[PDB]
């Protein structure tokens, strides 16, 4: 009977049961054809063509997305969809047709008794115990700045940057190859992602850190490859996530995440800015770098009025903050009226989703 | 005390929540400034139900608050109305002006057809709303207007007035528009069987009516009485290629899911000044029944006060205890800005 929470991202699906403190299942948002989904597709990627049905947070391939949802319900969670209200998540500024399509598939294809669609960043805010603040959400495919007032994401101030964890992995691959190492096969890409997640960090002052990496071995770390070779990682440790603050590193002409944060706040009314500055919540896998909260604090402090109280909140579980916020929301007694029911769907159709979501 | 202001293409209807009728009704016109009766270039700031001239709309709202209602806006929560499918930016601008120009303590924007439905005591049904500038068919499920099934027809009261002018001219009269509008409202009616009414009009002792013009001339109107609103059912009368209001009603219902159609058919609510013609309900009953399945129960609801149904629905909504949470407050506006209207409306 328990409500399901399914958080669909560009790189990973997080799925589980409302009321749990973590998703039961986390797996790659991939569909492979010579069909296979998730883990069983990346372990067979030799005989398979791989596709990502979600690009930059947006569903773009509905056929493959149904396969993902099918895999989630039956293979991963082992439930009959018709027995479980299902909460889904979506990107900020998701096109209306997409929300209607998601609703149509849930009710007509999977026959869920009830459903709801929530904005991912809003769920992250909820997980931190807040209903007002500004979320920096950075995953595998997209980064957003999302200011939120009493659970409402302020649409004119939402910022989107199409640079996230996948780009950082690609960039680390490139600069490690420049240092003489070799990372080309898909198995070698997994090594680079492991290095990224284990050894990278965000420098407090990039240029000083570069200068420090150049005059001594003090910033260096060793990493043992699968075959037992030990390699040394130097300024690549912080050059890789520096891309978030300087998108020009990969040729992108956008402002970095500190400036888009500031720009987002400045697109909000003056009365709320004080609360946003004091409630910067970081969400997503790509906000996990050591040093990133402290760097953001420094950069926002430099942009904001000198009298402004600035606070960056970086929960330890923020890889799963979106999912956890969904788990919380779907557990609240005040939320149960908010479900869209199959009965309502029978009457109003897919556009009923705009009445409640 | 909450205010209710229902802004139309031709008329502003304004008053106090809890009253059974608007206290102020006046022309939605600005002349250059002059507003309403006292209005130069004439302009209608609302066209086919949509606000298109914001400077003039502020002049209208100013005239409404101070000159007509004699109130201080900052003391009253204000409910405004909007057309079906009103662009998001327009709803935000209305909100911005109410808070920043008139400093209301609270506000709300409701869809006009939905308010009309509420005024008839229902939350599910289909509304035919026909005013001065636009006609809509709006199917509604539990207070939610179904966006894919809404129909808009730019044929309404102003066009009928123009047409009455045209066909009276055919018989030798010369036009003066305000006079013809008055003739329309007092003497026109919808024939149950148009062709039969046309054929028999010469032998009816009841159909000719005299109308005393202001300067004192007595003129006679015959079959123009029912030819004028026949245009609603036959838009070809004015060279328009749309189906008539019976067919747009049917088409709107057919864009809704089959599960709700019985409830739509049984809850056909007519709203607006241009639905006031004697005979229009029975003509609709006939025409919709001819299109619908024979097993379908059809009911046309046409309240005597339906000229003001939108306003009355607003008066009711703004008086409900379950609605008080729905108001957008000055504090919320101060934090979130104009887009806050999408959270609550």
């Amino acid at each position: 009977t328990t409500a399901l929470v399914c958080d669909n991202g560009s790189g990973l699906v997080k799925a589980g049961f409302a009321g749990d403190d973590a998703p039961r299942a986390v797996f790659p948002s991939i569909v492979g054809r010579p069909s296979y989904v998730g883990d069983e597709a990346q372990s067979k990627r030799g005989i398979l063509t791989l596709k990502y049905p979600i690009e930059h947070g947006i569903i773009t391939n509905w056929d493959d997305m149904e396969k993902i949802w099918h895999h989630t319900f039956y293979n991963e969670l082992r439930v009959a969809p018709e027995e479980h209200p299902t909460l889904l998540t979506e990107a900020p500024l998701n096109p209306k047709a997409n929300r209607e399509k998601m609703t149509q598939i849930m009710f007509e294809t999977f026959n869920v008794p009830a459903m709801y669609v929530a904005i991912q960043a809003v769920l992250s805010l909820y997980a931190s115990g807040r209903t007002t603040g500004i979320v920096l959400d950075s995953g595998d495919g997209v980064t957003h700045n999302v200011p939120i007032y009493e659970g409402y994401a302020l649409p004119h101030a939402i910022m989107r940057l199409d640079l996230a964890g996948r780009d950082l992995t690609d960039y680390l691959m490139k600069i490690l190859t420049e240092r003489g190492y070799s990372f080309v096969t898909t198995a070698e890409r997994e090594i680079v992602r492991d290095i990224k997640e284990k050894l990278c960090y965000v420098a407090l002052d990039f240029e000083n850190e570069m200068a420090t990496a150049a005059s001594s071995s003090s910033l260096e770390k060793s990493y043992e490859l699968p075959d037992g070779q030990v390699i040394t990682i130097g300024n690549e440790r912080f050059r890789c996530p520096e891309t978030l603050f300087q998108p020009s590193f990969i040729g992108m002409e956008s402002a970095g995440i500190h400036e888009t944060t500031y720009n987002s706040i400045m697109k909000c009314d003056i009365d709320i800015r004080k609360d946003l500055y004091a409630n910067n919540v970081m969400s997503g896998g790509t906000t996990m770098y050591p040093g990133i909260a402290d760097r953001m604090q420094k950069e926002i402090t430099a942009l904001a009025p000198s009298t402004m109280k600035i606070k960056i909140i970086a929960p330890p579980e923020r890889k799963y903050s979106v999912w956890i916020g969904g788990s919380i929301l779907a557990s609240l007694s005040t939320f149960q009226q908010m479900w869209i029911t199959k009965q309502e769907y029978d009457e109003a159709g897919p556009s009923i989703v705009h009445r409640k979501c | 005390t909450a205010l209710v202001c229902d802004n139309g293409s031709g008329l502003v209807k304004a008053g106090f929540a809890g009253d059974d009728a608007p206290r102020a009704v006046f022309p939605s016109i600005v002349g250059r400034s002059y507003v309403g009766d006292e209005a130069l270039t004439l302009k209608y700031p609302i066209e086919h139900g949509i606000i298109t001239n914001w400077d003039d709309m502020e002049k209208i709202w100013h005239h409404t608050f101070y000159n007509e209602l004699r109130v201080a806006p900052e003391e009253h929560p204000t409910l405004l109305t909007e057309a079906p499918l009103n662009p998001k930016a327009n709803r935000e601008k209305m909100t911005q002006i109410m808070f920043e120009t008139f400093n209301v303590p609270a506000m709300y924007v409701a869809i006009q057809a939905v308010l009309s439905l509420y005024a008839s005591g229902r939350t599910t049904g289909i509304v035919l709303d026909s005013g001065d500038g636009v006609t809509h068919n709006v199917p509604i499920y539990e207070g939610y207007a179904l966006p894919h099934a809404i129909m808009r027809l730019d044929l309404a009261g102003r066009d009928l007035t123009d047409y009455l002018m045209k066909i009276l001219t055919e018989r030798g009269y010369s036009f003066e528009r305000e006079i013809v509008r008055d003739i329309k409202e007092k003497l026109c009616y919808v024939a149950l069987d148009f062709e039969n009414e046309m054929a028999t009009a010469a032998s009816s002792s009841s159909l000719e009516k005299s109308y005393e013009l202001p300067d004192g001339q007595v003129i006679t109107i015959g079959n123009e009485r029912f030819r004028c609103p026949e245009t609603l059912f036959q838009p070809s009368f004015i060279g328009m290629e749309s189906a008539g209001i019976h067919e747009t009603t049917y088409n709107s219902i057919m864009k809704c899911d089959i599960d709700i159609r019985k409830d739509l058919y049984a809850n056909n609510v007519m709203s607006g000044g241009t639905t006031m013609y004697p005979g229009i309900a029975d003509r609709m009953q006939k025409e919709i029944t001819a299109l619908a399945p024979s097993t379908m129960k059809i009911k046309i609801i046409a309240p005597p006060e339906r000229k003001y149904s939108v306003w009355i629905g607003g008066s009711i909504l703004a008086s409900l205890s379950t609605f008080q949470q729905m108001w957008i407050t000055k504090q919320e506006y101060d934090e979130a800005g104009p887009s806050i209207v999408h959270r609550k409306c």
Partner: peptide
């Protein structure tokens, strides 16, 4: 319709009451 708090529950929610569960991820 017959006649014709939400945020506080979030702000005061106790996350320690959420169930521990094992996350499967490769």
């Amino acid at each position: 319709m017959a006649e014709i708090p939400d945020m506080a529950e979030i702000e005061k929610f106790d996350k320690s009451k959420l169930k521990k569960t094992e996350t499967q991820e490769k």
